[PDB]
Paper text:
The β-lactamase-catalysed hydrolysis of β-lactam antibiotics (BLAs) is of central importance in antibiotic resistance. The cyclic boronates act as ‘transition state analogues' for both ‘serine' and ‘metallo' enzymes and therefore represent a promising strategy for combating antibiotic resistance. The combined results reveal that cyclic boronates act as dual action inhibitors of SBLs and MBLs by mimicking a common high-energy tetrahedral intermediate; they also reveal that cyclic boronates can potently inhibit some PBPs via the same mechanism.
PBP 5 (dacA) from Escherichia coli, which is a non-essential PBP15, was potently inhibited by all tested cyclic boronates (residual activity<1% at 10 μM; IC50 for 2, 1.7 nM). Comparison of the PBP 5:2 complex structure with reported PBP5 structures reveals that the fold of Domain 1 (aa 3–262) of PBP 5, which contains the transpeptidase/penicillin-binding active site, is very similar in both structures; However, clear differences are observed in the position of Domain 2 (aa 263–356). Importantly, for the PBP 5:2 complex, inspection of the experimental map revealed clear electron density for the whole inhibitor molecule. Comparison of the PBP 5:2 complex with a PBP 5:cloxacillin acyl-enzyme structure reveals similar binding modes for the two compounds in the active site, including with respect to (i) interactions with the conserved active site motifs (SxxK and SxN), the conformations of which overlap almost exactly in the two structures; (ii) conservation of the predicted active site hydrogen-bonding network; and (iii) the same bidendate interaction of Arg248 with the carboxylate of 2 or the C-3 penicillin carboxylates. First, the conserved Ω-like loop that is conserved in PBPs and Class A SBLs adopts a ‘closed' position (that is, closer to the active site) when complexed with 2, compared with previously published apo- or acyl-enzyme structures. Interestingly, in the structure of PBP 5 complexed with substrate-like peptide boronic acid, the Ω-like loop was refined in dual conformations, one similar to that observed in the PBP5:2 structure and one similar to the apo- and the acyl-enzyme structures. Second, compared with the previous acyl-enzyme structures, in the structure with 2, His216 moves >3.5 Å to interact with the carboxylate of 2, which is analogous to binding of the penicillin C-3 carboxylate, implying an important role for this residue in substrate binding.
Author numbering: 4 to 73, 89 to 358
């Protein structure tokens, strides 16, 4: 029963936490992951997400200058966008958020409206932002799950913005500022994200992400007890996640997974696979025992068969139990067969 066991979770010294796989979205561990808490500076992930989308859209460059009104910024100061986004991500500067909010949306209210528009665009059911920096507000809240998903969106939708989160330091006005994510300096893990935060109502919060090979995990901890424990507890989850789980990529697009006969077509056989790449998070070491089969929606396949046409379902089995399902599609189209 060593292969088919469910691992016990470590005791995490925080009120809420969640651990997910970046590729497959699988939840490996959770505790009060949907309780609505104060997000503190984790809010700045969404602030960074709004900014990342605008630059990705081309609205402003990282070299553009922003004039201040009205990091210790002063009115009339001209600060490159590059420095303000680093003030947000590395330093957690609340003043840099305000500056970038007026610069990106014209006002803080217009910028909070965008933050909450992406909240709905991501489907978050337990998040609402009242601020651009994350200071405690009566009406703003988030949760460990929603914050783990915001971090996923950062990595997925704006990778150029996300690459900043791994920088250990930046210099503003001749003063070196360190990134507050102390896990970047950990020799045992490969941590390149994401964001720390803390307030009186929120406690000590950390959204972290690490990689081991091509596997990527995202942890979110909220309501942490101490400043140091913030990083220690997140390190507990990530190492635990990598020790007991492995992400595997069994089938990618274009790879033939099965062949079935085709009637009335230009060809006699169809090449069946998947249109979206498959990522499965399984107990580490059980990839050798992973079995895959499939069912068909029809007794026969009739031409014409369009490209990426659904014809059945793939079933991935581990220990005789289906763990994931994906649509089985036609890879190459097959037009109607003609007769001379």
């Amino acid at each position: 029963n060593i292969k088919t066991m469910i691992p016990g979770v470590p005791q995490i010294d925080a009120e809420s936490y969640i651990l997910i796989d970046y590729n497959s979205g699988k939840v490996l561990a959770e505790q009060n992951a949907d309780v609505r808490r104060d997000p503190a500076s984790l809010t700045k992930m969404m602030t960074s997400y709004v900014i990342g989308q605008a630059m990705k859209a081309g609205k402003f460059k990282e070299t553009d200058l922003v004039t201040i009104g009205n990091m210790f910024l002063k009115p009339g100061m001209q600060v490159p966008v590059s420095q303000l986004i680093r003030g947000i991500n590395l330093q957690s500067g609340n003043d840099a958020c305000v500056a970038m909010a007026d610069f990106a949306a014209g006002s803080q209210d217009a910028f909070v409206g965008l933050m909450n528009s992406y909240v709905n665009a991501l489907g978050l059911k337990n998040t609402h932002f009242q601020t651009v920096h994350g200071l405690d507000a009566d009406g703003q809240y988030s949760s460990a799950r929603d914050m783990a998903l915001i971090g996923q969106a950062l990595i997925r939708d704006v990778p150029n913005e996300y690459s900043i989160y791994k920088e250990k330091e930046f210099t503003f006005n001749g003063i070196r500022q360190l990134n507050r994510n102390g896990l970047l300096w950990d020799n045992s893990l490969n941590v390149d994200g994401i964001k720390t935060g803390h307030t009186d109502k929120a406690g000590y919060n950390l959204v972290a992400s690490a990689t081991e090979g091509q596997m990527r995990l995202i942890s979110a901890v909220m309501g942490g007890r101490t400043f140091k424990g913030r990083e220690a507890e997140s390190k507990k989850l990530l190492t635990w996640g990598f020790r007991f789980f492995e992400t595997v990529n069994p089938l990618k697009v274009g790879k033939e997974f099965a062949s079935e006969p085709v009637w009335f077509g230009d060809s006699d056989r169809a090449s069946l696979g998947v249109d979206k790449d498959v990522y499965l998070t399984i107990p580490r070491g059980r990839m050798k025992d992973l079995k895959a089969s499939y069912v068909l929606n029809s007794s026969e396949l009739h031409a014409p068969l369009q490209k990426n046409q659904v014809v059945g379902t793939i079933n991935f089995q581990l220990d005789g139990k289906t763990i994931e399902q994906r649509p089985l599609v036609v890879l190459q189209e097959i037009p109607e067969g003609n007769f001379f």
